Amino acid sequence: VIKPDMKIKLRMEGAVNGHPFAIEGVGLGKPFEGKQSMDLKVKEGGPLPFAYDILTTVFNRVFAKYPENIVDYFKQSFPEGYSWERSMNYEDGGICNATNDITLDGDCYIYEIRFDGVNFPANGPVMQKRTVKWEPSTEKLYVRDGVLKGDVNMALSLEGGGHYRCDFKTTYKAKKVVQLPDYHFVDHHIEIKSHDKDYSNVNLHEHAEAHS
Ligand code: NI
Ligand code: NI
Numbered sequence: 001v002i003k004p005d006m007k008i009k010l011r012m013e014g015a016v017n018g019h020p021f022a023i024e025g026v027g028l029g030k031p032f033e034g035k036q037s038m039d040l041k042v043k044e045g046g047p048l049p050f051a052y053d054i055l056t057t058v059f060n061r062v063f064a065k066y067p068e069n070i071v072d073y074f075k076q077s078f079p080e081g082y083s084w085e086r087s088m089n090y091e092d093g094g095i096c097n098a099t100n101d102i103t104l105d106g107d108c109y110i111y112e113i114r115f116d117g118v119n120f121p122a123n124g125p126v127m128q129k130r131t132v133k134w135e136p137s138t139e140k141l142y143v144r145d146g147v148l149k150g151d152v153n154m155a156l157s158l159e160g161g162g163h164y165r166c167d168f169k170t171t172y173k174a175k176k177v178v179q180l181p182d183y184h185f186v187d188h189h190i191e192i193k194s195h196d197k198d199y200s201n202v203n204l205h206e207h208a209e210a211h212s
Helices: none
Strands: 006-016 019-030 035-044 082-090 095-105 108-118 131-134 137-144 147-158 163-174 184-195 201-211
Touching (some): 006 035
Antiparallel strands (some): 035 201, 095 108, 137 184
């Protein structure tokens, strides 16, 4: 059911500091190589008044290269698919909640995404768009109450130098019973490869690899 080459379509609806927006996307990847990319377009609420970077990790752990010796919760959950929930706690009190419900239609994954950011300070790097990129990261994955958790210490590099820290807590939920993994890691590296001036168009890449 998992094919070597796969597509993606998605819609995100969200709000940051009570201002709504909508984004759509199409993309493609290689699930077994842990690579994907996508083009994203802002449909409503542009030009976004906040750092696009806060959204990019929300725009699928099926696109992660799992070796044979680690159970792959995500590829097993297909064709029924899985959903996830995430809280993203920024060091200045900015908090983002996100969810993604992932279904499969033919060779295409479909994402229905909600994003909700509150309490970003007007003079902070998100609302003044002073972020450069996310550093590559290592997510720690562990089972709890029959579902899979993933935690990660993330950092955004900042235009004047330095970093801005965010802690991610994700819960991933297969829509059917699957085998559960042991403790393991996923290395991630997410990059905006191109974009237009106000980020109404963005081309986003990620490569991920599981290890134990
Ligand atoms: Ni890389
Ligand atoms: Ni740029």
